Ligand binder design. Structure first.
Ligand SMILES: Nc1ncnc2c1ncn2[C@@H]1O[C@H](COP(=O)(O)OP(=O)(O)O)[C@@H](O)[C@H]1O
Ligand SMILES: [Mg+2]
Ligand SMILES: [Zn+2]
Lengths: 196, 230
């Protein structure tokens, strides 16, 4: 099941959602929460008993009638003529699936996936000094001051190393941050920056 | 167990002969014929002013006499009709066209089956109801019980709920895909099954299907509301 991207909403509109069928080999590629482009047919899958009002119904064009005592009326009549409602529903038939904003054109496996240009880019990034304040600025060009929050949130994004004991105690690795302050101090703004 | 034809002539007598001298029901019949009035209200006090035992029969057997009064007034409309109706409503145009074509192809001597006829309520365009007799005592909703079924009770209470006016089928109309003859299915039950095959003489003779389709356009509806009184 997929739904309209947040960019494409009309005014006052619920995000529509439609069901997308994934046939063989394009099957586990999609996952919940992703932002995926799909390509394929728009098909129609038959529906039945979708409406309480009678609608379009098929039936054979043979001109049969009903003899006395077996007259083609009511339930017998509908079964004899083979009447059946034709109610459909759009169901996209995804022939292929890609990320809508792909990360790469494709640590050692991801490194192999890196193209040469991005690999040297991240290499000189790592080799860079002052990357600390540079990342602060890049994450939060809008913000002024609040350097402690900049630093904490950046470290939060990188995260720690989860570990676990021999007994089985799951040592936390994530690092939760809290911003508390007087009103209109860019708290929700920091959260929105991390979101976007 | 009374001769309903005899009682029909008696209700005709009452409708024609009642006065108060202005001929209340005569004037209402003229208004009916002109289609300036869509419902007629009979007054059982006025009935009992001449024939109290008739009122007794009505109250002990109401719906039968609703039908008989309706039929009698239907039969009596042309007697009082003066000038052609202006054909206000599409329903009125339909009844005029159907009367035209049946009179066209009538073959007046010829005899036809009972079902090759217009359903008796399809051509009315007038309702008939009763205003209960003052002699009857207004009942109470606990007291009205099985021995009042089919009887003209008079009751009082507060209306606690009412739905909005919905259209209710009274005679479904259908059209064949072959013989070009309308078909009619009266309605008595709260629900119904719609027909499939055509009983028209031409369709049966040619032994074609004639799988008639339901028309919301050539059918009759009446405004339908339901309220919960207490
Ligand atoms: N130090 C700051 N630098 C940049 N903008 C700021 C700063 N402090 C407040 N603002 C402005 O205040 C606005 C609202 O801040 P916000 O964090 O939403 O308040 P709250 O924390 O009550 O949600 C932001 O849109 C932002 O532009
Ligand atoms: Mg806020
Ligand atoms: Zn027919």
């Amino acid at each position: 099941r997929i739904q309209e991207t947040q960019a494409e909403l009309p005014r006052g509109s619920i995000p529509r959602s439609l069901e997308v069928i994934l046939r063989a080999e394009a099957v586990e590629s999609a996952q919940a929460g992703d932002k995926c482009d799909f390509t394929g047919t728009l098909i129609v899958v038959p529906d039945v008993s979708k409406l309480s009002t009678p609608g379009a119904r098929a039936e054979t064009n043979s001109r049969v009638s009903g003899v006395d005592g077996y007259e083609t009326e009511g339930i017998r009549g509908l079964r004899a003529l083979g009447v059946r409602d034709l109610s459909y529903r759009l169901v996209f038939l995804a022939c292929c699936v890609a990320p809508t904003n792909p990360r790469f054109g494709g640590a050692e496996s991801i490194k192999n996936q890196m193209t040469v240009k991005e690999w040297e880019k991240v290499f000189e990034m790592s080799q860079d000094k002052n990357l600390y304040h540079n990342l602060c600025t890049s994450l939060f060009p809008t913000i002024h001051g609040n350097d402690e929050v900049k630093r904490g949130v950046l470290l939060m994004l990188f995260g720690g190393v989860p570990k676990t004991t021999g007994e089985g105690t799951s040592l936390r690795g994530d690092i939760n941050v809290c911003i508390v302050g007087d009103p209109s101090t860019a708290k929700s703004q920091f959260l929105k920056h991390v979101e976007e | 167990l009374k001769d309903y034809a005899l009682e029909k002539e008696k209700v005709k007598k009452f409708l024609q002969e009642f006065y108060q001298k202005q001929f209340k029901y005569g004037n209402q019949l003229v208004r009916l014929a002109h289609r300036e009035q869509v419902a007629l209200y009979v007054d059982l006090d006025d009935v009992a002013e001449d024939d109290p035992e008739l009122v007794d029969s009505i109250c002990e057997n109401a719906r039968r006499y609703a039908k008989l009064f309706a039929d009698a007034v239907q039969e009596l409309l042309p007697q009082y009709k003066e000038r052609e109706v202006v054909n206000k409503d599409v329903l009125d145009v339909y009844i005029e066209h159907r009367l035209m074509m049946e009179q066209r192809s009538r073959d007046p001597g010829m005899v036809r089956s009972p079902q090759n006829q217009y359903p008796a309520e399809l051509m009315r365009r007038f309702e008939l109801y009763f205003q209960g007799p003052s002699s009857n005592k207004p009942r109470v909703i606990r007291e009205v019980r099985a021995d009042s079924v089919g009887k003209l009770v008079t009751v009082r209470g507060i209306v606690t709920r009412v739905s909005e006016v919905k259209p209710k089928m009274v005679v479904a109309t259908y059209t064949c895909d072959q013989c070009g003859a309308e078909t009619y299915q009266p309605i008595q039950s709260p629900t119904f099954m719609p027909l499939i095959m055509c009983p028209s003489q031409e369709c049966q003779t040619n032994r074609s299907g004639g799988r008639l389709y339901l028309q919301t356009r050539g059918s009759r509806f009446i405004k339908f509301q339901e309220m919960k009184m207490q």
